[model samples]
Target: KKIEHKMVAVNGLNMHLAELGEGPTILFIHGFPELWYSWRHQMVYLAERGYRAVAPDLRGYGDTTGAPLNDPSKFSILHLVGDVVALLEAIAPNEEKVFVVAHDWGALIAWHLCLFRPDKVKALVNLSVHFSKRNPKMNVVEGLKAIYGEDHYISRFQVPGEIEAEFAPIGAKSVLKKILTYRDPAPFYFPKGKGLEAIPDAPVALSSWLSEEELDYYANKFEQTGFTGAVNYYRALPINWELTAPWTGAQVKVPTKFIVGEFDLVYHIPGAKEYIHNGGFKKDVPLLEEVVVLEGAANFVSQERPHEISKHIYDFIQKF
Candidate 1:
């Protein structure tokens, strides 16, 4: 029940880390618009059982300092991986490797971390997004434009200051609520005047997974930090593709497990199910040990189904 929060310098930026217990470490990386709080349930659940749990605010999110990346190119996985590597060295200098469990954008970065530097992660339990192996021939934005159209959310996020301007009138709490509450299992688009608030608030108003207290915490943080740093992550997608060329054909060589909700938006992404169930996902993540699909859950699967997700992580990590 005891969790300690701290801030330490890593990768030339201040990183906010939340930790619990103290045995083998399980480093939890959060996703876009999410902070270490996203993994609070798992952190405490795992820690109370045995293993130490650690989660950071990442660079641009939460109380962490220094972002909007300074250099847009550095906002990619290379920098994110560097941040994790440095954080581990400062906190667990004696350990060879720490366990990792990540979700959404965090899952995407964890897969890259394992691929680029397998030595740092003992095993991985990733949720939501899959490991998208690089394709040097095609940049990310081009692909988004082709299928998603220029009005697609990802495509709309390509510009630096444009999207940030749209979110200005919406306020921090509304922006956070819009995204955190979204549940559609398909690509989305926003017309010019709508902004993030137009999502229609799916996960609220009647005992949803998110609570007013939790929303206040997230909303307050976003209000303090502003959304530019967070939106910068989406802005760097094209460059992320460009920078990952070196990791082309690289496989995620760590012990891995994946989970997704049957109703989750990412699970229904066009060919997501086919790739995940078929041999394709395994080829990139050869060490993938298990896959489980929970019914009636949505995008925020971990928070939506904490007990099950925590147990799933513990079961896999305890095996090693």
Candidate 2:
């Protein structure tokens, strides 16, 4: 199926958005090492079932442009949320609220979007990342450092050009394939100098979910744009924490559905399992409708188990 692409100006970003079908819009937000293309499977699946599926390259990634690469401040949670809010207004002005389906970093931004402007979202289906209630005591990076040490991926991403320099040699295709195929539930560790050595090399046989064509699509984009724009998301975490003081105990009021792979690293984070199953997740997201855990799936559940995730997204949004 053919998908339409457009460049719409929003929040100072010349955002690139991909769209399919025509009906109630579903805004898809992607995460680290990913582009709007990450949502390719769901976009077509939902579009075929009567929903307008729209995914953007976000501020500094892929065909989107305008973020100042020299400054990481432009990539904070506030900026990320603002970009989506402005995009929604520009794309669906007539509709005050739309369905939001996001994964990973997209999920993090969706939670903030729901927190900052629940009025704009009819409902949300967030995968991988959960709405982590802000801790008044420690910011995210510091928290991760304490638990996983400086070698952890998020910690490793803090230095501006460090990780980028490391990825330069590994090549985008091999790096992306390795990341996309990773199934270990252990914390992501990338000790300096070691580069991606800790993470296994891409297996000779690709997972059934990804094709060489799909991998090339991602590598081509990363090769052009580089990974700094994506890495800046992690760099801005401290700023996100500092700016979100007022929302310290905020609740995500929008109706929501959360899905995570059983082997997802985020799902394995200490206390994460208990938080999701022991009422903490529902407590923070009071309107959280359901939590779906896909067995044998890993971090990239939306792509790995596209049909199941699309059905989950469709099933929940249809109720609202």
Candidate 3:
């Protein structure tokens, strides 16, 4: 909780980085619409235990500058991967490698980091999403459409500004509450008129894992940045798919570990569980040490159960 902030210019953007403690860097990368604040719980927890905890606001979120307003293509995986590499170049120039922990899009990017530059990441613990191999046949939107249909959230986010218009009336707090409180296993979609119908602007009760102060912290940042730059990540999915064509069969050879909630819908997405548990996730991620399924955890497993997640990080990484 005593982490301080700094601005480091990288990848044509000034990145706002959160840092605490001292030792080999344990870099934390957050997911969509979330800032470095999302990792504060674990940062404070682990930093005190003898590791340097560093998390950044990423390129577009929080205080980071130059979110691509017009061109969504600027948010390419190369662009994001460039940001991570540049940040590390500035901060950890002396270290040969660093530990990483990430979730959601962060997890996806972490996998790419291992693929693109395995030398930088010594080990990684990815939460929620797994290492989904690049599809040489279909684009991202095409794959999502085949499985989840046009009503799927990722499909809905494809067109620029359409959902922003829908989310405008819903307001920032409402939009964030809807995203944060989501515990559904089925495909997510916005219906005809009600965007946050299931998730209220002010929920009667907050998840025990999240707090009103924390929600306010996120809402205030999103309120300033709007959702354009953040949504651009989703908008660039197909583009990202197209760009990663050459890595189709590349296995993430880093020392890797994964964790996901038992109720995560990624498992429910047509044969996903079979793929992860028995289907060849191991073959793809050959050095993957473990796949942890928290008993009753859900999407925000790192935040929902910070202590457990932190312990998992310590227990696994202390070996190396």
Candidate 4:
């Protein structure tokens, strides 16, 4: 499929996006260490099925420009949400509603976008991540610590330049590899009642799913765009929390779906399910459609099972 690429101004940023086919719009939002290519399977599938499938190199991620590099204020979730809203307005000017599918951080933004502008999104589907109810008092760091222990990898990324430097050696390729293929369980485990301090020394395990070509693509993008801008997302957690605090109590009000890998460490983490289920989203998004878990899948569920994932997405949209 030859996807048409375009450049448009969205929330003060010039975003590079790819669009295919034409019908009810379906926007695909990718997460960290990934670009529009992450949804390659879905784009072709959805387009062939008669939907306008669109994917964008989100601000600061790929070919998009406008968001500042290494700037926390610019990378906050609210700001990112504004970017998507603007993209929607610019690209789908004639349409009042569209389907939105997102993964990881993209899912986070999609969830918030629905909450802040329920009428704009007809429905939402997210992978790996789950919805949570508003917690006005807790920020990302506090929330992660409360749920995944103090030394959670996610919380560590929020330390501004620190984690970026740690992961910079291999650029976005390494990060992407970790995200796509890291499946060993030993390094992540800690003894009961012991903090992260007691974990034994275990060398980082390389990713298994990414091939040389795949890693090169991601690496080259990061080399051009640099990792600091992407890492800035973590740095802006507090700002994001503060900006969305008013809506911290808010929950998504649209039809929602969750596609997760059964073996994802996120689910194995302590209190993961309760945190996602009862968290602020339970009552707010009463239209939640389903929470489907794929057996033996990992965190990168989309790449791991694109065909099955696309099927669920197609079925969900049909039902709506």
Candidate 5:
């Protein structure tokens, strides 16, 4: 029940992380607008099972420092991957490999990490985001359009200054609530099918799971760090596309698994499921173990069903 916390400097940044148990290392990566606490349930579960479950605040969120807000280049995918590599080196110097788990944007970075350093990743598990073959010849914007049609919200985030203003009103706390507490078929852009462009100008209600005290924790952290560092991730998509192009058609050789909420709006997004199944995913990940779709779940599957998510992760890792 008690979690240990520590700080380590990785890639010129001081990152705060929480850890529990001791055994094979299991690294948990949090997604946008979230902290290590997102994996609180899993961390405890894995730790009890005799694994070292660790979750860092990640570069721009929570107590992590050294990720500068002014430098968009610092937030690039390669740099973020580099940050994790450095953290891995610091924490698991003796271990030859470790299991890495991530959700949301964290899954995106984990995908890059496995591609960038396959030897270090012993196994991989991700939620929400799915793997796709890298397209060396195509730009990310072009790739998204080719696969997701013109209405993809992820592409819209890439537009210059688009997300900056969208996140300014209630700041990170408000945005976090909108994302974490959101249910699929979110009224904002549903039915009309206008994508993120139809998002309401006013903030949605807070997530049921995030208490006022917890909300303050997120608000205070963002108040100190601002949101530019996180926004830089959106700016670097094009560069990431170019950097990872060589791996097109390559699949993850390591044991991997995917978990998604059946009701997650992401699956319904035009061309989403087809892209995952027909696109490079099947070709690239030869050892793909399983794809678990939780009935009645949504994008924030982990938060919505922590016990079930933990059980899946536990069972999956045991097989490896």
Candidate 6:
């Protein structure tokens, strides 16, 4: 357990930070239903190579506290990005820029962080989610709802209490296991009343990459913290869209390398494959360096393929 934990105040909330190593800083941002612990593998890997790895339980997750779970606005993209900026200010005041690595919701935030404040990021290695040029006409929730209908997970999460209640009966451990183990590349849909049952069941035998002890760690945190804070990220979509109007068509100026699991549902989303592989991607991200899709990998590719992800991240960031 070389990883060190501490709390620091940023953006009016106390953020829990897991830190390692002592060199150029690398900020690892975790996605939905995750904690700073999500970057465990990457943290240790980068740290050993003389990089300072910093992973924080952002806003309402894990040991960090003070976000009003009832207020979705508190979880907006601006707030998330601001928190990271402030966190950087506290953790690495001497460094003008630091490397960023993120996945899922974290990747989305990283996109905005790069968009809103490229001065703070030297480069970024993003996983799962890609930069989506803001659509001025509609919010992402509305767009997702129109295409996938209300049953879609992001759409389902908009109503707040509805989805949390659905998850209640299933318990945190079961729910976490189900989400973390989900391998299907199709769109995630949660039908009314079916709750998590609407999705495929987690395999009886866990993937070799994730063990019961790891599962218990996630379960323990979520059980104590609950899901509202995590779900609020989805709930804040409309507000996030409204707030990001000025940056419509903004290009992500940060030097970036993107990696996604071949079986990642985000990659399978309608038009996603084309957008990522075609010129559309590089056009928006002019500094885009590379895109790698791992064969047979799924959503949680960081954990599922830790060594490969570490190498990819190292290969990209070492250039700077």
Q: List the candidates' TM-scores in order.
A: 0.94, 0.97, 0.95, 0.87, 0.86, 0.97
The residue ranges of model 4 lying beyond 4 angstroms of the native Cα positions read 146-151, 184-209, 275-281
Q: What lDDT tens digits, residue by residue, belong to model 3 across residues 35-79?
A: 899988789888989999999988678899976767899888889
Clashes of 3: 0
What's the lDDT for all of these models? Answer: 0.82, 0.90, 0.84, 0.77, 0.76, 0.90
Mark the 10 consecutive residues where model 3 has the least summed lDDT: 197-206
RMSD of each: 1.8, 1.3, 1.9, 4.3, 3.9, 1.2
User: How would you encode candidate 6's per-residue C-alpha lDDT over 76-133 as one tens digit per residue?
Assistant: 9999998999999999999999999999999999999998899999999999998887
Q: Itemize residue pairs with steric clashes in candidate 6.
A: none
The residue-by-residue lDDT of candidate 5 on 1-320, one tens digit each, is: 69999999999999998989899999999887678888888998889898999999888777888777666667778888998999999999988789999998899899888877899998888898787555557775677567655545556556556656656655777666556666654323211223244544322342455567766777778777776666667667777777776776666777889888886665665556786666446566777765788886777777778899898888888887
lDDT per residue for candidate 4 within 94-181, as digits (tens), equals 9999999998889888988898899999989988767655457777667777766755666666666665566555456655555556
Question: Which pairs clash in the backbone of model 5?
Answer: 136-245, 251-284, 251-285
Indicate the residue-level lDDT of 270 in model 1: 66
Query: How many steric overlaps are in each model, in order?
Result: 1, 0, 0, 6, 3, 0
Judge candidate 2 at residue 137 and give its lDDT.
91
Off by over 4 Å in 5: 142-156, 159-162, 185-197, 200-212, 277-280
- Between candidates 4 and 6, which one is better according to lDDT? 6
Determine which window of 10 residues in candidate 1 has minimal summed lDDT: 198-207
Write down the TM-score for model 6: 0.97
Shift of residue 143 alpha carbon in model 4, Å? 3.1
Off by over 4 Å in 2: 201-206
